[PDB]
Design a protein around this ligand. Structure first.
Ligand SMILES: [Cl-]
Length: 177
């Protein structure tokens, strides 16, 4: 497995992601371009780290990367060490346990769960209820079109949306209320 960082300080740098897309990341980070510098980012299901790593490359101030798979969390840590990225941490946890505590506010949150039903709406409510979001946070949500629009709290509004293939890529903006 290889991950390519397509932008920022490590643009073009290639990283191994063990035995277990560009246009997506391109679209998302174009949406995030004017807020990404010095942002605090949380990746709820970091997986390969594609999202968190691209965020750090583009001069995010910091990224907390949450990943349930121990082997995957370990490789992520190794890739951060390669890149000399000290302004990040990896927590080996499922998102439901992790977010069910008093949180810390983030400017940008990535919500791309490995499966939708049982995780997506639950994660969204925990983010909102436990203080994980800064006053005007952006939350990226990836979901199959077939699922419809996810239930979001009333103070979240749909900010950007792209549909490609079977998948809806969305960015919500949250108002502190
Ligand atoms: Cl989870």
């Amino acid at each position: 497995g290889q991950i390519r960082i397509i932008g920022g300080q490590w643009r073009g740098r290639k990283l191994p992601v063990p035995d277990s897309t560009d246009r997506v990341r391109e679209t998302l980070f174009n949406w995030l371009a004017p807020v990404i510098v010095d942002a605090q980012c949380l990746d709820c299901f970091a997986g390969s780290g594609a999202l968190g790593l691209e965020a750090l490359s583009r001069y995010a101030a910091g990224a907390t990367l949450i990943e349930m798979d121990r082997a995957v969390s370990q490789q992520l840590i190794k890739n951060l060490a390669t890149l000399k990225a000290g302004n990040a941490r990896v927590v080996n946890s499922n998102a439901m346990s992790f977010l069910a505590q008093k949180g810390t506010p983030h400017n940008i949150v990535f919500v791309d769960p490995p499966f939708r039903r049982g995780l997506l709406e639950e994660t969204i409510n925990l983010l909102e209820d436990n203080g994980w979001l800064a006053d005007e946070a952006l939350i990226y949500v990836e979901s199959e079109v077939e699922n419809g629009l996810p239930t979001v709290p009333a103070n979240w509004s749909l900010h950007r949306e792209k549909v490609a293939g079977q998948v809806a890529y969305r960015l919500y903006q949250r108002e502190a209320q």
